[PDB]
Amino acid sequence: LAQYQKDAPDHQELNLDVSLQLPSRSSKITHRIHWESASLLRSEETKENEGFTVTAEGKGQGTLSVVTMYHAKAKDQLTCNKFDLKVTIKPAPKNTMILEICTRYRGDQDATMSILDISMMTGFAPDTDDLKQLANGVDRYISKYELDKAFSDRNTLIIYLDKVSHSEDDCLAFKVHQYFNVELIQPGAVKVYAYYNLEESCTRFYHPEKEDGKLNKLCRDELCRCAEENCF
Amino acid sequence: FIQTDKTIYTPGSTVLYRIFTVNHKLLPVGRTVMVNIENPEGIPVKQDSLSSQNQLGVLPLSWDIPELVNMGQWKIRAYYENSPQQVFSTEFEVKEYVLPSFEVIVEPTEKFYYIYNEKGLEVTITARFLYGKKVEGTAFVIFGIQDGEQRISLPESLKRIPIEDGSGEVVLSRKVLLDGVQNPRAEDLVGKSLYVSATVILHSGSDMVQAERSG
Amino acid sequence: DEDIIAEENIVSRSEFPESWLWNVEDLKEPPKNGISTKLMNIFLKD
Amino acid sequence: IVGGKRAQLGDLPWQVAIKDASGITCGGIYIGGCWILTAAHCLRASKTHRYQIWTTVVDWIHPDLKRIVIEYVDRIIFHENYNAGTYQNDIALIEMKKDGNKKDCELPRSIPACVPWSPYLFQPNDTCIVSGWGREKDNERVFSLQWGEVKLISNCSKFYGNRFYEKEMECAGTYDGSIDACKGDSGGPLVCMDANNVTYVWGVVSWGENCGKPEFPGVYTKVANYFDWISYHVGRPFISQ
Amino acid sequence: GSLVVKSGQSEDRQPVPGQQMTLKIEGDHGARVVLVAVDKGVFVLNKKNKLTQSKIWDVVEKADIGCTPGSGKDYAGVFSDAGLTFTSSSGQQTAQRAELQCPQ
Amino acid sequence: RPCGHPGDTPFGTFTLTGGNVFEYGVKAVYTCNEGYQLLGEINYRECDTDGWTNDIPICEVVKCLPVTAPENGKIVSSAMEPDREYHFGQAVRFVCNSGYKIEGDEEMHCSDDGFWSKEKPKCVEISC
């Protein structure tokens, strides 16, 4: 038994030589799998998607895993996956318009506390009287910080909601006045989300009668150029 | 001793770290050190064997992070070549992030909660920008009870408070605490802990920070 | 216009490192009660 | 390069290196202005900014640091009809960026190597020189720049058959000489000299096969067929068509 | 020894983005000092695994060979529990230690 | 007219010459760290009426030539394997085969000079 522990042999020899053999020329990536570095993950990347040949030789055992990373098209919505937002801006009956925002939670239960992040269009500002009327109770909240600012330099606003319904749309509206006049008006935006998760949000843009939120883009297949000026 | 320049890194950035090589008297020495980079799964992905000689006990190294990578707690494992049984480690998180530009501090009045305190756990929220100036905004504070690793949120304890002059206060009432758990016997809560989560949003709505104080 | 810096004369800030000043300095100055003070000039980031 | 001798700084100025973080991957050739001619197959990263370009390096371990100027990579240009299976249309362009202070990139060392316009300029059995940083025998080595003489051979379908395309490829190899660029020196220059010693880029190292066996010569993608393709991207400046 | 990093200029001059500043470093003669400047935003996201002096002394104290605050059951236990081996020619000696780790 | 920040190159530092703020007429000289060489004759950037001088200097790690195993000996240490460049810092080990004793320096690392800290040893038969 003492001679058995003497003639005791250490470990089964591990020495793999794994060569990537490509018909084309690039560099020469060789791999020496030894006992001292058996657990070392040896990753080799290849940009062309193709059948190729792997040639291993030597004593020992190994595992080969070919895993290809890519970009897959997504049917499911990447933006506004958990919230529906519809924003409309219409001329009210000096230029004043009416902004209407209707949101609905896409869940089984009601949404909790949410944030309405409203950015004005360049040159427009909310009506002070209208904000105070929305802010009183009714499960809404506009901070004093927002309500005290003058009509000028009031281009951002945050309306706090105590909850938003999942059963139907909760809608609000208020008047917006044109305090600055510009030939090119930048579209405003509204962003709804729940306080416990900022990633699950929805953002819509508005521009006085310009479909959706988007600028005049020219798109085909993947590749879009800006078309936000005169045709010629 | 391993020192990384930061605690968290984005995919693509370079990790700069120094290994200080001393003896049991903490005096700088020149020896050979084996370094292993290890992914959150546990598989070593980069081994190396360097020398501390002519380096005055300081060994400057760097490791490049691939673009496509698995997030989570990575590890650097070093050990002297002569002593492979004494393995020193440091972790660094890999994650996609942006700087919050401000800090939120959730500070309870006491470092504990007396089970028979009717006032409950009063917490002060202090938010200030990273350059010192205070922060005006709104904070959503919510409480929870932690039992080992099982967290039970208390929906009734949700509060919305104004952050005025960089400071706010929010109280978890004892009644809500007892009502949240489905056990009238308060003695069972002894041995458990409370955690507080606060989300502060600027009035501009351009930054949001969630912070937590558990245990 | 009048009384304003032209657009081309404004150099935008671009240096926003999360960590920097990964430098090495040696204290070779004549000691004062065993302490050697070294004044080091650094350029702050943006 | 199997055979050949160690290159020295003055000999082949038009040689250009491409080195990533993990060693050096192939190498191109300077064709004037701020443009480099390489193979499309070797570099295939839409994460191009890290690629870096070295010139007049000759030896990878002890540069002389004198006039060893290296330049960043601005933009890559791949052939639209590149085939990955047959290695057809294996050509690509490299644009080197320089600061806005100077209009162009001034590299006073490397010499342009012109572009061929017709496949009839040079014929087989002509003395051509392919040079780069490849691997002689199977030895890794590849520290110092190697160059060697090769001959163009006609109708390469005798050795490769259907895989070869004479309109878009060209074969150069020495019988029993085995002097053949191999592995690491892909996309490199296949340079041939004229009667005036005007230096031409007849081809770039495409795919080939295992060096050594004279019954399998190296295959290089022919430059003269893609003369008009380069002109569209780099304009009409430089050498007379 | 000691190592202090402080302002190498006056306290009227305020730091401005890009402005040169002087850093006063005072430490032991001949010591090699390594530096690092980190944005505090990093620590707002993660403030763990940070190198401090307290953690260094922690590692040292965890590799200590003593296992008791003091004394022992006998005169040999005092030496063994305080991380010492006493051995006299007359025969008074401490028991052998075959455990790298302290008893639980 | 103040130029921009000249930018930090990896494994290197820069000093301003002729002034204390990135203004017109200053020079920014670069110098790599220990174990890193400054390849390229261009090492400075100068604030002109437009911007700085051409591009940004580069710092590369010095490399050491790979060493084969001595006769009747093998090298089974170091990094991820064969016949490759060894950059600054890395170290190798020599262990002679059974029946052969080492005759020189057993360890060595990649020194500053792009050369090894010690010379390659020999493996001689065990003799008493």
Ligand SMILES: *[C@@H]1O[C@H](CO)[C@@H](O)[C@H](O)[C@H]1NC(C)=O
């Ligand atoms: C091959 O090329 C050489 C050029 O040196 C020429 O002399 C020889 O005749 C050629 N042989 C054939 C078979 O074309």
Ligand SMILES: *[C@@H]1O[C@H](CO)[C@@H](O)[C@H](O)[C@H]1NC(C)=O
């Ligand atoms: C090309 O033609 C035949 C194909 O039938 C081929 O076997 C031969 O080697 C080539 N001949 C010449 C003159 O190139």
Ligand SMILES: *[C@@H]1O[C@H](CO)[C@@H](O)[C@H](O)[C@H]1NC(C)=O
């Ligand atoms: C061209 O190269 C040959 C090669 O020896 C040389 O003799 C000659 O001088 C060179 N120049 C011209 C104009 O032929």
